[PDB]
Design a protein around this ligand. Structure first.
Ligand SMILES: CCCCCCCCCCCCCCCC(=O)OC[C@@H](O)COP(=O)(O)O[C@@H]1[C@H](O)[C@H](O)[C@@H](O)[C@H](O)[C@H]1O
Ligand SMILES: *[C@@H]1O[C@H](CO)[C@@H](O)[C@H](O)[C@H]1NC(C)=O
Lengths: 289, 31, 230, 315, 213
């Protein structure tokens, strides 16, 4: 038989060591990012409103995940006599995560559209379209999320049902949460970088956009380090739940990898403030005075 | 200079009664 | 020059249908609302229908409601009146009347003429005729049911004159203002419920039938015809 | 000079803070507003916008009564005839266009196209139904009759470009400010300058006449306004603030002359107390530089026009 | 609101609809202000494709308006502030000319260093370049320019030196890009270059709007 007492004995303390300062830093970081960008919606509306919309959307998704962190923290060691608090916490956790993912993907798509066709989007770019896009992002996340956690439930974020790890509910997750967003991020970043570097022949002043050729090159990077191992662990765990990998000293390592990747992906709510919000000079001057 | 200033003050005081911007007009009388 | 020419009339059997057309040459027809005003034989004027400049607001008369249609053709600069299920009381002398509504505007100025024969504020003038020798000022009085004075200081009273064998022309608009191209002898005054028209001198041109109309609300009701003659 | 204006006016009680609110906002133009003029009826106003548009409004009900396209988009000034039949316009085309609003056709057409100024037209103000006074960037002013269009009298003597022009209530004299940091008082009937004043150290951008016709306050780009008296032949008082470092685009005087309204380049306007030489009110609500500012004939409302394509009526 | 006030309100609604119908054209319009010289060849350049002229045309379904102010241009800031909304400023120079290079450089420095056009890109055209090679062969460059370094008889070196001297007048580089071109008096491909530069300026505007940096 396979006993997972050691991996759990280690992973409890690992969560207690990594997640607490992650939540502590992310809470203040998002509470500063939101207030910092709320100024641009009251005094710099016609210029930066379109960006501030999805920026604030991403910030509030990160804040929702940060606030959901301490509840799984509490319910990772003790059981509360309630079958609804775990469901609510799981739903909030995963909704915030896969909402931030979609928001980042849409940010990359919007940048690529604004770059590839500047004259076309000089007219068809208003905060009404972006408000509708954020609304449909929330709507799609909720409708694709609730019918998953409705079939989850002895503890919280442990021992999922035997239909949660089925092909009909795991393949859509992998396809719609990693494959397509990663491909879109890669295309919309590589094409944008190549286009922005091809401005050298148009005008020698391309050096004026040096920073613009690095921020996207950061976006294409901190996205891999916070989403690739997590879905790799998801795929491995799905592999070991339908009679494909059965051996001791291996399933333990896969459980450890998946738990650790899920504990380390939660620092993306803290790395997104540096990726997107801190590379903006106006943000730096606004929050530092 | 003093005479011109005195005349300006006298003209201002004479016509100060009919300044709708200086004295808040009532809403009923407000156009 | 302004020229409204109306055609399409004639003799119609009872219960039939017809179309009256009006060309509007010599002015910006797109910016002017249009009215239809008929005149029964040996009778006064009565408003029929009205269409705005943009053909957005359309008004009819209770007698012709659901029976008359009014349409505008801006590219062709024409006005159309389609009449169906006619009765013997539809015999009149239709006129197309210009109008335009902004601040300081003077609607109901230019008219026309056409003939059709078929086989509510109360405005009336009790005096059928006012014979008077020339040389002395003549006063014409018109009575109203409601008060034409508005809260903004406007009095929607209209004084028109029709000469024998001619078409009506606007004398005074809004009870206190004279239309362009009019002698200075004419004047108008009055209170909110009472009005009066004063003529300083009388000539062969001034003899005719005077009419009073209100524009406070639709339908617009004419008064009686005061026959000023020597 | 014996006694300063401030010394005499020290005995006068301060006016205090006045709050003027936007009763109605006039919108519909698609570009920056460059000029406006108040009609004699105190209800109709004409405004010019750099999208080549002229709009006459109904200030009481925010009703668009007239909308006239312009031949040249680069228009800097507009005017309203005292009798209310014609409107004037001008700009970079060195031509003053007079439009007649009472055509029997039902539309508004250009009554005349006066030409003859070397530079761009910078101000036009009607004298009567058949006369107009204009100023140009060729450092001169002119008097025109619209019956023929010939320059009845050309006023020369300005070194820099003339910027603003205002007419006396009696319509017999006027004053003009230019870029030579000086203001000249001209006589319509005579035709040569009589008084010249040089107190500012920068280009004068606006000028206006006191309602009594014996004094005038003018503003320049040095963020100061200065009041001059015709009989005194000397500067009376300077209205300026340390926090104000932006030039003055327009000026206007109240009916009694107690409150002087001046538009600045800091996205708002100020209401100074002329006698007390102290700030009295602030007109804010424009998200761009205010270009034109006008006090109505009755003294009830005040109209302001800025670069945000919005016109604001205050009371 | 009486029966006649409703009609006035309807007329105002029609007028407002007419004004709003053309609000797309003013946004779609692309403005280029021409600030060439007398000997630069502005008249010939215009014919190939204070009197204020406006030339309106359409390139690739994009409306372009060129404002020519040749004849009289004032130095007052009020006059120049009328052109703060133009998309680009075109500066035409005579490459083959020798004595007028300093005056054109001074004019370019005065135009660029003004705060009015801080949000306007600058396009540079060097016309009559077919005679430039003959002029540089007959008379060298180092004679008329002490600071010049390189081969005085190399056309590429002369063009690079001219471009560097023109671009050195830009006090600030962060505001908007500065472009350049070399065309003759008989070529008919300047419209494509103008459209490309306008597209580059629009892309820069969108990049600044996206707050990517
Ligand atoms: C349409 C796309 C977007 C829609 C919104 C997002 C919806 C989906 C969100 C992701 C849900 C993915 C499924 C849950 C994964 C998870 O959080 O999984 C817990 C892991 O821990 C795996 O462990 P699990 O399968 O629960 O069971 C082990 C014990 O937990 C452990 O303690 C023991 O040691 C082991 O042997 C196992 O028994
Ligand atoms: C998971 O839950 C099932 C169903 O109750 C149970 O049989 C199994 O032992 C549990 N696994 C654990 C607690 O590791």
């Amino acid at each position: 038989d396979c006993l997972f007492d050691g991996v759990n004995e280690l992973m409890k303390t690992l969560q207690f060591a990594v997640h607490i300062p992650t939540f502590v830093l992310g809470l203040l970081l998002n509470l500063l990012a939101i207030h910092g960008f709320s100024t641009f919606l009251k005094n710099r509306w016609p210029d930066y409103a379109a960006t501030s919309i999805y920026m604030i959307n991403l910030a509030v998704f990160d804040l929702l995940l940060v606030l959901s962190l301490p509840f799984k923290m509490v319910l990772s060691q003790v059981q509360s006599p309630f079958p609804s608090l775990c469901t609510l916490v799981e739903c909030l956790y995963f909704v915030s995560m896969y909402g931030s993912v979609f928001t980042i993907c849409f940010i990359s798509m919007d940048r690529f559209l604004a770059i590839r066709y500047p004259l076309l989007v000089s007219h068809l770019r208003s905060p009404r379209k972006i408000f509708g896009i954020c609304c449909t992002i929330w709507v799609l996340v909720w409708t694709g999320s609730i019918p998953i956690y409705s079939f989850h439930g002895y503890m919280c974020f442990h021992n999922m049902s035997d239909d949660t790890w089925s092909a009909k509910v795991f393949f859509p997750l992998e396809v719609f949460g990693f494959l397509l967003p990663m491909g879109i991020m890669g295309f919309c970043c590589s094409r944008s970088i190549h286009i922005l570097l091809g401005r050298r022949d148009h005008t020698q002043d391309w050096v004026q956009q040096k920073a613009c050729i690095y921020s996207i090159a950061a976006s294409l990077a901190v996205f891999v380090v916070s989403f690739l191992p997590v879905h790799l662990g998801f795929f491995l765990q799905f592999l070991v739940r339908n009679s494909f990998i059965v051996e001791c000293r291996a399933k333990q390592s896969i459980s450890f990898f998946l738990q650790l990747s899920m504990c380390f992906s939660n620092v993306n709510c803290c790395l997104d403030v540096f990726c997107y919000y801190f590379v903006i000079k106006e943000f730096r001057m606004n929050i530092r005075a | 200079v003093s005479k011109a200033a005195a005349d300006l003050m006298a003209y201002c005081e004479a016509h100060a009664k009919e300044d709708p911007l200086l004295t808040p007009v009532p809403a009923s009388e407000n156009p | 020059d302004v020229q409204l020419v109306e055609s399409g009339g004639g003799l119609v059997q009872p219960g039939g249908s017809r179309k009256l057309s009006c060309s509007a040459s010599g002015f910006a027809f797109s910016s002017f609302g249009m009215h239809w005003v008929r005149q029964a034989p040996e009778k006064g004027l009565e408003w029929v229908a009205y269409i705005s400049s943009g053909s957005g607001t359309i008004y009819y008369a209770d007698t012709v409601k659901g029976r008359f249609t009014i349409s505008r053709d801006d590219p062709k600069n024409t006005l159309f009146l389609q009449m169906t299920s006619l009765r013997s009381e539809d015999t009149a002398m239709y006129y197309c009347v210009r109008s335009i509504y902004y601040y300081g505007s003077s609607p109901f100025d230019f008219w026309g003429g056409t003939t059709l024969t078929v086989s509510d504020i109360v405005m009336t003038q009790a005096t059928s005729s006012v014979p008077v020798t020339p040389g002395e000022s003549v006063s014409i009085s018109c009575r109203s049911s409601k008060s034409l004075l508005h809260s903004n200081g406007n009095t929607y009273l209209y004084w028109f004159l029709q000469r024998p064998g001619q078409s009506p022309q606007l004398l005074i608009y809004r009870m206190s203002n004279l239309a362009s191209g009019v002698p200075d002898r004419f004047s108008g005054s009055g209170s909110g419920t009472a009005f009066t028209l004063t003529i300083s001198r009388l000539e062969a041109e001034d003899v005719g039938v005077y009419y009073c109309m209100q524009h406070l609300e639709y339908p617009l009701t004419f008064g009686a015809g005061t026959k000023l003659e020597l | 000079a014996d006694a300063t204006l401030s010394q005499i006016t020290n005995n006068i009680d301060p006016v205090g803070r006045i709050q003027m609110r936007t009763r109605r906002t006039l919108r519909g133009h698609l570009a920056k507003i460059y000029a406006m003029h108040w009609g004699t009826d105190s209800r109709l106003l004409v405004s010019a916008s750099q999208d080549g548009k002229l709009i006459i409004w109904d200030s009481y009900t925010t009703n668009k009564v007239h909308a006239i396209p312009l031949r040249s988009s680069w228009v800097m000034t507009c005017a309203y005839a005292p009798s209310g039949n014609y409107v004037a316009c001008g700009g970079l085309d060195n031509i003053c266009s007079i439009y007649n609003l009472k055509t029997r056709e039902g539309n508004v057409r250009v009554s005349r196209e006066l030409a003859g100024h070397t530079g761009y037209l910078s101000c036009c103000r009607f004298l009567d139904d058949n006369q107009i006074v204009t100023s140009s960037g060729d450092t001169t002013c002119a008097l025109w009759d619209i019956e023929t269009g010939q320059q009845t009298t050309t006023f020369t003597g300005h070194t820099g470009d003339v910027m603003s022009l205002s007419l006396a209530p009696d319509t017999r004299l006027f004053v003009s400010g230019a870029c030579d940091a000086s203001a000249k008082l001209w006589d319509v009937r005579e035709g040569m300058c009589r008084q010249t004043f040089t107190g500012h150290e920068s280009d004068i951008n606006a000028i206006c006449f006191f309602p009594n016709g014996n004094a005038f306050a003018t503003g320049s780009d040095d963020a100061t306004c200065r009041l001059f008296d015709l009989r005194a032949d000397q500067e009376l008082m300077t209205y300026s603030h340390d926090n104000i470092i932006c030039g003055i685009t327009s000026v206007s005087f109240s009916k009694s002359g107690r409150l002087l309204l001046a538009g600045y380049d800091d996205f708002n306007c100020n209401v100074w107390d002329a006698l007390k030489a102290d700030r009295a009110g602030v007109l804010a609500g424009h998200d761009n530089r205010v270009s034109c500012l006008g006090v109505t004939d009755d003294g009830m409302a005040v109209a302001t026009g800025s670069w945000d394509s919005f016109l604001k009526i205050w009371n | 609101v009486s029966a006649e006030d409703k009609a006035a309100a309807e007329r105002s609604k029609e007028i407002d609809k007419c004004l709003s119908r053309e609000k797309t054209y003013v946004k779609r319009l692309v403005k280029i202000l021409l600030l060439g010289a007398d000997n630069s060849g502005k008249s010939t350049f215009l014919k190939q494709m204070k009197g204020i002229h406006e030339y309106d045309f359409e390139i690739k379904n994009v409306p372009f308006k060129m404002v020519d102010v040749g004849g009289q241009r004032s130095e007052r800031k009020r006059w120049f502030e009328c052109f703060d909304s133009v998309t680009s400023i075109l500066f035409l120079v005579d490459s083959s000319d020798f004595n007028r290079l300093t005056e054109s450089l001074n004019d370019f420095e005065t135009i660029v260093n003004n705060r009015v056009f801080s949000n306007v890109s600058i396009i540079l055209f060097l016309n009559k370049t077919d005679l430039l090679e003959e002029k540089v062969q007959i008379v060298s460059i180092k004679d008329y320019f002490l600071e010049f370094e390189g081969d005085p008889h190399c056309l590429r070196d002369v063009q690079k030196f001219l471009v560097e001297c023109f671009r050195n007048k830009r006090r600030d580089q962060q505001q908007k890009p500065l472009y350049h071109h070399f065309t003759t008096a008989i070529n008919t491909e300047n419209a494509r270059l103008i459209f490309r530069d306008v597209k580059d300026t629009i892309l820069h505007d969108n990049l600044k709007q996206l707050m990517l940096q």
